[PDB]
Amino acid sequence: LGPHHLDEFVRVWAEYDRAACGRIHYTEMYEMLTLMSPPLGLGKRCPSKVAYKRLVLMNMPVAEDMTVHFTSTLMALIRTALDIKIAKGGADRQQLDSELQKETLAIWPHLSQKMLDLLVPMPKASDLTVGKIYAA
């Protein structure tokens, strides 16, 4: 992955969701990943337990209508494809996420904790994800 694939995400978002910071719940996820080319993950020919075991590696918090943010999902795809500081679950992935947050602040200090917290969405173990819904 470079940004070359990464702008396709904007296109599929605008067309298939028109979310505007939310408005996905979860259907758009597998309405997204199950069609578009596989440098981002699933693709069309992989709507199976292989997709299941990809999703179980992506974990991220929830919003009003069981929805999620734009760039939270963006980092979700990015790290689940490039393997940027992801564990197999638990507080292990949150401490890896703390490492990642430290690294992000180290590169970019100009990110306010509103936007920064958005980029490090902090999916605590108690707070269920949009990832651990169809998995369990």
Report the interface residues with other proteins, using CB under 8 A: 1-3, 82, 84-85, 99, 103-104, 106-107
Nearer to other proteins, 73 or 101 (CB): 101
11: helix, coil or strand? helix
Q: By CB neighbour count within 10 A (0-12 exposed, 13-18 middle, 19+ buried), where does 63 fall? A: middle
129: helix, coil or strand? coil
Shortest distance in whole angstroms from residue 121 CB to other proteins: 18
Shortest distance in whole angstroms from residue 86 CB to other proteins: 13
User: Per the annotation, does 23 bind a ligand?
Assistant: yes
User: Per the annotation, does 45 bind a ligand?
Assistant: no
- Rounded to an integer, what distance in angstroms lies between the CA atom of residue 1 and that of residue 6? 8
Per the annotation, where are the binding residues for Ca(2+)? Answer: 17, 23, 28
